[PDB]
Scaffold this active site. Structure first.
Site, PDB file in Angstrom:
ATOM      1  N   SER A  13       8.038  -3.683   1.545  1.00  0.00           N
ATOM      2  CA  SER A  13       9.360  -4.009   2.028  1.00  0.00           C
ATOM      3  C   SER A  13      10.345  -2.945   1.567  1.00  0.00           C
ATOM      4  O   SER A  13      10.197  -2.354   0.498  1.00  0.00           O
ATOM      5  CB  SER A  13       9.774  -5.398   1.518  1.00  0.00           C
ATOM      6  OG  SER A  13      11.127  -5.701   1.810  1.00  0.00           O
TER       7      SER A  13
ATOM      8  N   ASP B 114      -5.420 -18.783   6.015  1.00  0.00           N
ATOM      9  CA  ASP B 114      -4.999 -18.122   4.784  1.00  0.00           C
ATOM     10  C   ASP B 114      -5.183 -16.611   4.880  1.00  0.00           C
ATOM     11  O   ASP B 114      -6.283 -16.111   4.678  1.00  0.00           O
ATOM     12  CB  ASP B 114      -5.829 -18.691   3.623  1.00  0.00           C
ATOM     13  CG  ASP B 114      -5.507 -18.056   2.292  1.00  0.00           C
ATOM     14  OD1 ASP B 114      -4.473 -17.362   2.219  1.00  0.00           O
ATOM     15  OD2 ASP B 114      -6.273 -18.302   1.317  1.00  0.00           O
TER      16      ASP B 114
END
Length: 330
Positions: free
Chosen positions: A199, A35
């Protein structure tokens, strides 16, 4: 040193991925959910409330000659779905894919919430975010990667998740045969303890690319792709009959649909998520309403590049002095 371990979807929807981890002496092998959105290595154990164990493999520290109670240490964590676990702490030897760390904090669960109990395939979590998020008190502990880093050939790990197929976590090296083209690296902020990056935009299907900054985290422990409501609305508007359902808890779409792809930007590069990856199947057995793999982050407080996004790429988690993230197509 290096390590290399195969990671395998827990079910036919890729709801999560498990990776075998060796703990203790002799080894006790548990299948952990790696994770990159949290920083605790915790396991189902001989200390876990019996009624909260249903099929998981447990770590039994009393059977490990290298286990030692970390006296006074406790931990308690909650995740974004409201699930949680807590307990006490041992140090022990932990190996992943041939890479061994001695003195790793292994957090033994005394209690786990219902969704953990119900997940018989997940024996615990191995956190790979920054150690500043580790929950152990009163002495915060380091992640497996943080402990291994100095010994690694290169201070990196990579995630290569499969779509409906096994994949790989590598530690200490970049497998240049595992991706196509080049790797595009992008800046990371560690201010919130995550692999947080920006992004450069998105496209829906064969549509034009929209240049826009989307701050989010690369999180292998989150199944879906959670993005701003504007972006998600633009995606689902291209699917006839798709709608956001308050009762279901997100966007659903007709199971008869062919979903379009979704592209996200990494610098000037582009990662394409095929439409198939965005299908999470019937909302309930036999339903003709299907659950979407791109959902709104509104009310989460952060955008999350979860497995839906990450499995479309070969992803480098670069833990150099100034961390960065790399993405390649594959």
């Amino acid at each position: 040193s290096t390590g290399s371990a195969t990671t395998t979807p827990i079910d036919s929807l890729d709801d999560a991925y498990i990776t075998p981890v060796q703990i203790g002496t002799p080894a006790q092998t548990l299948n952990l959910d790696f994770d990159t959105g949290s920083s605790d290595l915790w396991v189902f154990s001989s200390e876990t409330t019996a009624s909260e164990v249903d099929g998981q493999t447990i770590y039994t520290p009393s059977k490990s000659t290298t286990a030692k109670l970390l006296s006074g240490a406790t931990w308690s964590i909650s995740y974004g779905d409201g699930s949680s676990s807590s307990g006490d702490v041992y140090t022990d030897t932990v190996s992943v894919g041939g890479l061994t760390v001695t003195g790793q904090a292994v957090e033994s669960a005394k209690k786990v919430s219902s969704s953990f109990t119900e997940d018989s395939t997940i024996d615990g979590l191995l956190g790979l975010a920054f150690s500043t998020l580790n929950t152990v008190s009163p002495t915060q502990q380091k992640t497996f990667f943080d402990n291994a880093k100095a010994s690694l050939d290169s201070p990196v790990f990579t995630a290569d998740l499969g779509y409906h197929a096994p994949g790989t976590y590598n530690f200490g090296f970049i497998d240049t045969t595992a991706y196509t083209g080049s790797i595009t690296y992008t800046a990371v902020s560690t201010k919130q303890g995550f692999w947080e990056w920006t992004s450069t935009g998105y496209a829906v299907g064969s549509g034009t690319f929209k240049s826009t900054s989307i701050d989010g985290i690369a999180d292998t422990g989150t199944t879906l792709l959670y993005l701003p409501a504007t972006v998600v609305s633009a995606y689902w508007a291209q699917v006839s009959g798709a709608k956001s359902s308050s009762s279901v808890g997100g966007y659903v779409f007709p199971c008869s649909a062919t979903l379009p792809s979704f592209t996200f930007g990494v610098g000037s590069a582009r990662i394409v998520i095929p439409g198939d990856y965005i299908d999470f199947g019937p909302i309930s057995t036999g339903s003709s309403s299907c659950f979407g793999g791109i959902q709104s982050s509104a009310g989460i407080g952060i955008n999350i590049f979860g497995d839906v996004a990450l499995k479309a790429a070969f992803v480098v988690f670069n833990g150099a002095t100034t961390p960065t993230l790399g993405f390649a197509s594959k």
